[PDB]
Amino acid sequence: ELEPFQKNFYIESETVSSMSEMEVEELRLSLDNIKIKGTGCPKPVTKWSQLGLSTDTMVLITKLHFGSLTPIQSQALPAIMSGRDVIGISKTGSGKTISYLLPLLRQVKAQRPLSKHETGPMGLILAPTRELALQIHEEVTKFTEADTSIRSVCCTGGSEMKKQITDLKRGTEIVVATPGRFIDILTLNDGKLLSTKRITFVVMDEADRLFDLGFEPQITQIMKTVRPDKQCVLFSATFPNKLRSFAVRVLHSPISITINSKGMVNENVKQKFRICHSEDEKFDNLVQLIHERSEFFDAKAIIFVSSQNICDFISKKLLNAGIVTCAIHAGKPYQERLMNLEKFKREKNSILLCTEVLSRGLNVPEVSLVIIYNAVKTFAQYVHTTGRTARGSRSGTAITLLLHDELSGAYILSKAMRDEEIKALDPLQAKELQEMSAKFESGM
Ligand code: NI
């Protein structure tokens, strides 16, 4: 008859809870393309203060972690603090450790102390190597140092067992261990020196490595002696089939968090840009682009603009210059939208001229060329506009005509383009891009 306990310690800050869904999508794209799976994921935070940690802890952390929250921290901290099981896929050095330590500290702190007959622990962190266990435990101590109500003992192989037994004699709220040693300690002396009965929180870090180094049997047996309503988080740089299979076995309604696994834009889309200095130059490029394309002759294009007034203007402009377009926007009667869409889907080598906001929902097949005439200002809009050309192997090209003053636009391009896409273009255009993006970035 299990003892009930609290796992959700998260109070969403007002400023975060005010965020809309579109805002949250955008924040995830900007944070190195965070991808989530699972139901009910809390919104990412962007500041240590949105987590409701005491001043002590705040001072301590800062001290402990210098600079901005990492993408993994932004998303994993509120999900774990909320008591959810979590799969966190991110590289070593992404700061993942505090992502689980803070919530673990909080959870263990809240539980009643160990009785005079209870060994502990309440929290268990498993690592595949002695070197990682020691590193994790060093972190832990930087927090248990201030607070004498909480101990951690590090239990690994390649190290005296008797030494660690002397520790565990005194009871311990937290254990950091390699799987073999832990199992060895559990079974030792009728399992009377270490109990699993009070473990409510298990973390497995570098989880892919645990299978690599043959620990499936040990970690599987450990999870079998742990209450199944425990909170469990699995952190790993990769997600091999073995881990995927293990998570299904040990987790409930997990939230998976993957940081920039793949590119925000399909890698088969060829992203390009041209930096211009007047609307006129932008228009000169747009025309050169439309003619040039013909020498490579389905093959259709879509010019994206930012407003209905711009769409009308550019439509007339392009007309006066011998180029006929199928123009579309929400200020036009639906009947003529349909006429233009059908004309576009009908006529060979047609050109659609469309507002960026209608891009996600356009009912047309993928195209060979997207010309973004007004650099978009969000990551979400960039994905929807460029995605109009995405088509696995048959993906075409998306090109942005950017103006010298469009700093945020350059920030987006610098974050969504592949490095090798920026290399193949003129090194001065490239250099301006990076300068534009840096200026925007320090602008905040
Ligand atoms: Ni310039």
Side-chain angles (χ1 to χ4, degrees), residues 275-277 403-405 429 432 436:
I275 298 191
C276 296
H277 300 83
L403 293 162
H404 180 114
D405 306 314
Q429 294 268 120
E432 211 183 330
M436 293 179 182

PDB file of all heavy atoms in Angstrom, residues 275-277 403-405 429 432 436, ligand 1:
ATOM      1  N   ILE A 275      21.047  40.174 -50.594  1.00  0.00           N
ATOM      2  CA  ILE A 275      20.916  41.418 -49.850  1.00  0.00           C
ATOM      3  C   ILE A 275      20.834  42.643 -50.769  1.00  0.00           C
ATOM      4  O   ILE A 275      21.747  42.925 -51.544  1.00  0.00           O
ATOM      5  CB  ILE A 275      22.053  41.573 -48.832  1.00  0.00           C
ATOM      6  CG1 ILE A 275      21.978  40.428 -47.818  1.00  0.00           C
ATOM      7  CG2 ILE A 275      21.970  42.904 -48.129  1.00  0.00           C
ATOM      8  CD1 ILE A 275      22.864  40.618 -46.624  1.00  0.00           C
ATOM      9  N   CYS A 276      19.731  43.367 -50.669  1.00  0.00           N
ATOM     10  CA  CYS A 276      19.496  44.515 -51.524  1.00  0.00           C
ATOM     11  C   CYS A 276      19.484  45.808 -50.720  1.00  0.00           C
ATOM     12  O   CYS A 276      19.365  45.793 -49.488  1.00  0.00           O
ATOM     13  CB  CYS A 276      18.176  44.345 -52.268  1.00  0.00           C
ATOM     14  SG  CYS A 276      18.141  42.950 -53.392  1.00  0.00           S
ATOM     15  N   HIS A 277      19.596  46.932 -51.417  1.00  0.00           N
ATOM     16  CA  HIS A 277      19.629  48.222 -50.731  1.00  0.00           C
ATOM     17  C   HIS A 277      18.497  49.206 -51.067  1.00  0.00           C
ATOM     18  O   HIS A 277      18.410  50.281 -50.466  1.00  0.00           O
ATOM     19  CB  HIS A 277      21.002  48.863 -50.898  1.00  0.00           C
ATOM     20  CG  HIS A 277      22.103  48.026 -50.344  1.00  0.00           C
ATOM     21  ND1 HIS A 277      22.683  46.993 -51.051  1.00  0.00           N
ATOM     22  CD2 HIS A 277      22.689  48.021 -49.124  1.00  0.00           C
ATOM     23  CE1 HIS A 277      23.598  46.412 -50.306  1.00  0.00           C
ATOM     24  NE2 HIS A 277      23.631  47.025 -49.137  1.00  0.00           N
ATOM     25  N   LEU A 403      16.577  43.229 -47.227  1.00  0.00           N
ATOM     26  CA  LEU A 403      17.091  44.594 -47.247  1.00  0.00           C
ATOM     27  C   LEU A 403      18.066  44.837 -46.119  1.00  0.00           C
ATOM     28  O   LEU A 403      17.909  44.324 -45.013  1.00  0.00           O
ATOM     29  CB  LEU A 403      15.953  45.618 -47.165  1.00  0.00           C
ATOM     30  CG  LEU A 403      15.037  45.643 -48.384  1.00  0.00           C
ATOM     31  CD1 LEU A 403      13.724  46.345 -48.034  1.00  0.00           C
ATOM     32  CD2 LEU A 403      15.731  46.292 -49.581  1.00  0.00           C
ATOM     33  N   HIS A 404      19.063  45.653 -46.424  1.00  0.00           N
ATOM     34  CA  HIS A 404      20.100  46.047 -45.482  1.00  0.00           C
ATOM     35  C   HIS A 404      19.550  46.324 -44.071  1.00  0.00           C
ATOM     36  O   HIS A 404      20.184  46.002 -43.073  1.00  0.00           O
ATOM     37  CB  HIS A 404      20.830  47.273 -46.066  1.00  0.00           C
ATOM     38  CG  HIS A 404      21.933  47.812 -45.210  1.00  0.00           C
ATOM     39  ND1 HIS A 404      23.259  47.776 -45.594  1.00  0.00           N
ATOM     40  CD2 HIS A 404      21.910  48.451 -44.015  1.00  0.00           C
ATOM     41  CE1 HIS A 404      24.003  48.343 -44.662  1.00  0.00           C
ATOM     42  NE2 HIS A 404      23.211  48.766 -43.696  1.00  0.00           N
ATOM     43  N   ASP A 405      18.362  46.905 -43.980  1.00  0.00           N
ATOM     44  CA  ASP A 405      17.814  47.295 -42.677  1.00  0.00           C
ATOM     45  C   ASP A 405      17.068  46.171 -41.957  1.00  0.00           C
ATOM     46  O   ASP A 405      16.649  46.333 -40.809  1.00  0.00           O
ATOM     47  CB  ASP A 405      16.861  48.471 -42.862  1.00  0.00           C
ATOM     48  CG  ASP A 405      17.510  49.622 -43.597  1.00  0.00           C
ATOM     49  OD1 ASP A 405      18.660  49.976 -43.250  1.00  0.00           O
ATOM     50  OD2 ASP A 405      16.882  50.158 -44.532  1.00  0.00           O
ATOM     51  N   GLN A 429      28.101  39.152 -49.179  1.00  0.00           N
ATOM     52  CA  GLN A 429      26.710  38.959 -48.814  1.00  0.00           C
ATOM     53  C   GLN A 429      26.680  38.173 -47.509  1.00  0.00           C
ATOM     54  O   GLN A 429      26.107  38.618 -46.513  1.00  0.00           O
ATOM     55  CB  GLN A 429      25.964  38.214 -49.917  1.00  0.00           C
ATOM     56  CG  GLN A 429      25.834  39.008 -51.215  1.00  0.00           C
ATOM     57  CD  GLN A 429      24.549  39.827 -51.284  1.00  0.00           C
ATOM     58  OE1 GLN A 429      24.590  41.055 -51.396  1.00  0.00           O
ATOM     59  NE2 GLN A 429      23.410  39.152 -51.222  1.00  0.00           N
ATOM     60  N   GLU A 432      27.756  40.384 -44.593  1.00  0.00           N
ATOM     61  CA  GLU A 432      26.726  41.312 -44.205  1.00  0.00           C
ATOM     62  C   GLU A 432      25.655  40.549 -43.394  1.00  0.00           C
ATOM     63  O   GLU A 432      25.240  41.006 -42.327  1.00  0.00           O
ATOM     64  CB  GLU A 432      26.140  42.010 -45.432  1.00  0.00           C
ATOM     65  CG  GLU A 432      25.675  43.397 -45.107  1.00  0.00           C
ATOM     66  CD  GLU A 432      25.018  44.132 -46.258  1.00  0.00           C
ATOM     67  OE1 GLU A 432      25.350  43.892 -47.450  1.00  0.00           O
ATOM     68  OE2 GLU A 432      24.174  44.988 -45.938  1.00  0.00           O
ATOM     69  N   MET A 436      24.452  41.692 -39.780  1.00  0.00           N
ATOM     70  CA  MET A 436      23.055  42.032 -39.551  1.00  0.00           C
ATOM     71  C   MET A 436      22.483  41.219 -38.391  1.00  0.00           C
ATOM     72  O   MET A 436      21.830  41.763 -37.501  1.00  0.00           O
ATOM     73  CB  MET A 436      22.240  41.771 -40.812  1.00  0.00           C
ATOM     74  CG  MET A 436      22.570  42.689 -41.963  1.00  0.00           C
ATOM     75  SD  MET A 436      21.600  42.308 -43.421  1.00  0.00           S
ATOM     76  CE  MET A 436      22.228  43.492 -44.594  1.00  0.00           C
TER      77      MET A 436
HETATM   78 NI    NI B   1      24.225  46.696 -47.105  1.00  0.00          NI
END
